[PDB]
């Protein structure tokens, strides 16, 4: 006695999800410079890398 | 940069060069004139002339 599931429900959550714009951020360096940043962050300057 | 390599030929005289050198190399030096032709057109003309016998064969390939 409910409306559990059906074909008409396709796209429910994606349609419901409010749209949020992507923040404009400066591009990261590529290649050797990217590796340099990673090495400095993980070894030189310095819990997980994405811990809160 | 600043350096290059190549091959050079010096013939005893111009006639020997004209007698032994390739046509394109002679053209590059101005000793010969390039003749404009199309190989496909030559082939088509030859094939057309194949079907005609006698003196008229000469103009048969034109078509």
């Amino acid at each position: 006695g409910k409306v559990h599931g059906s074909l008409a429900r396709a796209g429910k959550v994606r349609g419901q999800t409010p749209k949020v714009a992507k923040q404009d951020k400066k591009k990261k360096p590529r290649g050797r410079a990217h590796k340099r940043m990673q090495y400095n962050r993980r070894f030189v300057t310095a819990r997980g890398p994405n811990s809160s | 940069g600043g350096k290059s390599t190549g091959f050079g030929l010096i013939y005893d005289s111009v006639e020997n060069a004209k007698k032994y050198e390739p046509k394109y190399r002679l053209i590059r030096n101005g000793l010969d004139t390039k003749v404009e032709k199309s190989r496909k057109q030559m082939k088509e003309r030859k094939n057309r002339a194949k079907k005609v016998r006698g003196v008229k064969k000469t103009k048969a390939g034109d078509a």
């Binding site: 559990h4 059906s6 074909l7 | -």
Partner: protein, 141 residues
């Protein structure tokens, strides 16, 4: 015990040959039955959408998995193909042209979807991934 006679090479070879058939992987690739299956030994196959169908998820999950009934063009066989991603069934219509790939487990059902061994990769010549990300648009005709 094993046979060990120096002149018993024939028996060892024959015994291994006979016992290889007990191996399911060996038998699958040596019985010549792959050509009677819907894909007939191909990675992909094109087909026409006949009908959208909802398949209940297996226990302990509860969901309606969206799938399409597709007839393969090259042999006329009918299969069930899963349509992945949210709301991607809306990009499928009856009589549409779809490219079908395997579900990743080499002819066996995946996850909580029962009896489904295929998925839709493209619809009307446009990949479902591009449609989901709005990179491309489904052709009008």
């Amino acid at each position: 015990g094993k046979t060990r006679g120096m002149g018993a090479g024939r028996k060892l070879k024959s015994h291994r040959r006979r016992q290889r058939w007990a191996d399911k992987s060996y038998k699958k690739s040596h019985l010549g039955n792959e050509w009677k299956k819907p894909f007939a030994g191909s990675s992909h196959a094109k087909g026409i959408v006949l009908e959208k169908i909802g398949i209940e998820a297996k226990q302990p999950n509860s969901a309606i998995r969206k799938c399409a009934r597709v007839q393969l063009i090259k042999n006329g066989k009918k299969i069930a193909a899963f349509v992945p991603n949210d709301g991607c069934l809306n990009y499928i219509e009856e009589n549409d042209e779809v490219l079908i790939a395997g579900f990743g487990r080499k002819g066996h059902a995946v996850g909580d979807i029962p009896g489904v061994r295929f998925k839709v990769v493209k619809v009307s010549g446009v990949s479902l991934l591009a449609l989901f990300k709005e990179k491309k648009e489904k052709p009008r005709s």
